Amino acid sequence: SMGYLMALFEDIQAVIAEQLNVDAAQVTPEAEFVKDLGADSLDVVELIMALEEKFGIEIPDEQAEKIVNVGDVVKYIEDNK
Amino acid sequence: QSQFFIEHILQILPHRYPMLLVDRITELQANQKIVAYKNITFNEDVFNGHFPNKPIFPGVLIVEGMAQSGGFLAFTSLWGFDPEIAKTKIVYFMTIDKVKFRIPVTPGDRLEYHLEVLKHKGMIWQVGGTAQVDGKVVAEAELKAMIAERE
Amino acid sequence: QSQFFIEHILQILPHRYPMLLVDRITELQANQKIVAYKNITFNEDVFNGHFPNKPIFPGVLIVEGMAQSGGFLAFTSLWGFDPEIAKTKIVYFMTIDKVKFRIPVTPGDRLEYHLEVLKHKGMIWQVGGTAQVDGKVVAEAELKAMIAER
């Protein structure tokens, strides 16, 4: 269960890394997609859709817009599993 | 409606000469797919430059045609044939992928656009498919676009 | 050479008006990279249609511009500035990938293409790179080509 979450986070990391051409080592729960990870508007849109695909979920733009850091998107994926 | 002519296309797409590259829509299934086409004739300004003595329709304009078809599908899927609400958005081309050119397209060809919806969420549309001449594939592409308030 | 002007481009590339979308080449490191550009002005027919009252340089012509650059590279990297055999060779692109459009390009912009040779096995050229306005990246694309017999 705790190990589930860790492995899940490791998978979320890989997507964000790959998408934003960034080292996993930079993809901390704190890291902000724009400010720290160097993502523009198109990057964020493609990232959301990439995460949506990978973990087979959906995120409405009303709550997709609230997210700023990777931790936000992590916590989001954990709720909608 | 399932068949749209140039008069209909003009009311929906903001593109005008020389960048309107869809002549007719022959098949439309909301949120699913579209079949449209552009006639290719020697009497187009492009062929002056591409190329002198050998007219070949630019592969990037095939992709543009497909994108325009995809755009028409996205709009009428979300708002139907609404020329008035058409005049409150233009459509932005986000990405292009997996483009392959197979056969040259020339004056005399009817260039058909076959696009499936690959994914759509709200306002972002991802479509892919082919361009065909006489039931043979001449080109392939995937692309992503989103809708934006116009001018 | 390393810097090429429209006179020169016209002797290598077979494209003409309105499909020659490179104005000048500023850097040419053979087999590794090229930097060229096209000026974007309102006085271009394409802005009659794209779009009325909102001139935006079409994304697909940005890609065609990069490709024409990539093709100038490939030809010079393998024959140098030789108009004479340019008359019998044309660089044909076959694929396009990872295209992204980030910033609208408009009249007044200097659209720079930077393309670096990605791989060059056998007879397949692959180039990739970016298009830029004022330091910023407006678009990226990755392309493959082969050199053919006009």
Side-chain angles (χ1 to χ4, degrees):
Chain A
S1 165
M2 174 160 28
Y4 169 64
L5 299 174
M6 299 164 70
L8 179 62
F9 171 79
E10 188 144 333
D11 293 334
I12 296 175
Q13 258 197 273
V15 182
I16 294 173
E18 175 213 50
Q19 285 291 286
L20 305 184
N21 193 237
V22 151
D23 265 312
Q26 311 171 226
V27 193
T28 80
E30 294 79 50
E32 314 198 5
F33 288 119
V34 172
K35 166 178 339 165
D36 307 279
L37 267 39
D40 63 10
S41 161
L42 172 88
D43 281 346
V44 170
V45 174
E46 279 212 302
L47 174 56
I48 299 298
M49 295 180 62
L51 290 168
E52 273 168 319
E53 192 260 22
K54 175 66 175 201
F55 303 108
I57 55 153
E58 208 190 315
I59 304 174
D61 306 52
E62 65 157 339
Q63 273 166 338
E65 204 175 47
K66 283 296 172 74
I67 68 177
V68 174
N69 57 284
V70 344
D72 288 333
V73 89
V74 167
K75 170 120 175 303
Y76 185 98
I77 294 173
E78 297 173 349
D79 304 345
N80 316 359
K81 303 249 175 35
Chain B
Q1 187 176 352
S2 194
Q3 242 201 309
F4 303 80
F5 301 78
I6 186 59
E7 51 193 358
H8 303 107
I9 297 162
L10 281 165
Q11 298 173 254
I12 300 313
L13 297 189
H15 308 66
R16 290 304 187 267
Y17 179 95
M19 278 303 300
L20 178 55
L21 303 173
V22 189
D23 290 328
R24 200 169 288 172
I25 291 129
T26 53
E27 180 173 354
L28 176 105
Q29 253 152 246
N31 296 286
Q32 295 178 60
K33 83 174 202 145
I34 185 169
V35 182
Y37 72 83
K38 179 199 193 296
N39 279 339
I40 308 306
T41 186
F42 183 75
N43 201 37
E44 301 184 62
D45 194 39
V46 271
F47 293 120
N48 283 311
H50 195 280
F51 304 89
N53 289 119
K54 185 153 196 48
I56 292 149
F57 199 69
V60 296
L61 292 185
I62 303 181
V63 181
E64 176 60 21
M66 291 168 80
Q68 278 171 33
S69 297
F72 189 89
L73 170 61
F75 181 84
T76 53
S77 279
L78 277 196
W79 291 292
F81 192 82
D82 190 318
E84 264 272 354
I85 281 162
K87 307 223 323 306
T88 179
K89 347 320 303 167
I90 66 180
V91 165
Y92 274 33
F93 207 11
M94 300 177 71
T95 71
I96 315 177
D97 276 285
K98 304 175 183 183
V99 183
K100 306 194 168 66
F101 303 120
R102 290 160 67 154
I103 299 165
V105 177
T106 63
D109 292 339
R110 176 175 165 252
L111 176 71
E112 317 168 38
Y113 308 122
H114 299 260
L115 281 305
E116 290 174 336
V117 176
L118 288 186
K119 212 31 195 167
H120 91 278
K121 179 188 63 220
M123 300 308 184
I124 50 198
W125 287 78
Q126 188 194 331
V127 296
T130 61
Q132 311 186 12
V133 173
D134 296 331
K136 302 216 94 184
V137 180
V138 305
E140 312 163 43
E142 291 196 350
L143 56 101
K144 187 147 69 265
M146 87 173 329
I147 61 101
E149 232 135 272
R150 13 172 70 211
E151 211 38 52
Chain C
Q1 350 186 343
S2 172
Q3 184 175 59
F4 297 82
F5 294 88
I6 191 58
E7 346 288 343
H8 307 135
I9 299 182
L10 279 166
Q11 279 167 305
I12 303 315
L13 294 196
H15 312 59
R16 297 302 190 249
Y17 180 93
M19 275 303 293
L20 179 50
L21 307 174
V22 186
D23 288 325
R24 203 172 283 163
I25 298 135
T26 54
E27 305 173 40
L28 189 77
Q29 301 177 200
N31 278 277
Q32 155 97 31
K33 73 175 198 178
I34 189 170
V35 170
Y37 69 91
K38 179 199 192 307
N39 279 350
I40 312 295
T41 188
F42 181 77
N43 200 40
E44 300 185 61
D45 195 26
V46 62
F47 296 118
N48 285 304
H50 197 284
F51 301 93
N53 291 297
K54 192 168 206 167
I56 296 173
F57 194 69
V60 298
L61 302 183
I62 297 171
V63 178
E64 174 66 13
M66 298 163 71
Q68 279 170 21
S69 293
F72 189 88
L73 183 40
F75 183 93
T76 49
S77 282
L78 247 59
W79 290 278
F81 188 81
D82 194 338
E84 197 54 35
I85 57 199
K87 303 204 285 183
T88 60
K89 298 230 170 334
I90 184 171
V91 191
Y92 160 68
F93 286 76
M94 336 159 296
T95 79
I96 300 174
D97 292 279
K98 307 173 179 185
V99 173
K100 295 172 184 153
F101 299 121
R102 304 183 182 278
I103 301 158
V105 172
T106 67
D109 284 348
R110 160 161 316 181
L111 178 59
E112 321 158 35
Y113 313 116
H114 324 347
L115 284 309
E116 42 174 329
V117 171
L118 286 201
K119 321 320 203 71
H120 182 20
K121 182 185 81 178
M123 278 340 283
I124 282 188
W125 285 84
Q126 167 171 358
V127 298
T130 57
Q132 314 194 89
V133 174
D134 294 338
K136 305 200 166 191
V137 171
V138 293
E140 18 182 308
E142 167 186 295
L143 308 113
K144 292 184 188 185
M146 75 164 183
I147 292 88
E149 187 78 8
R150 284 208 208 176

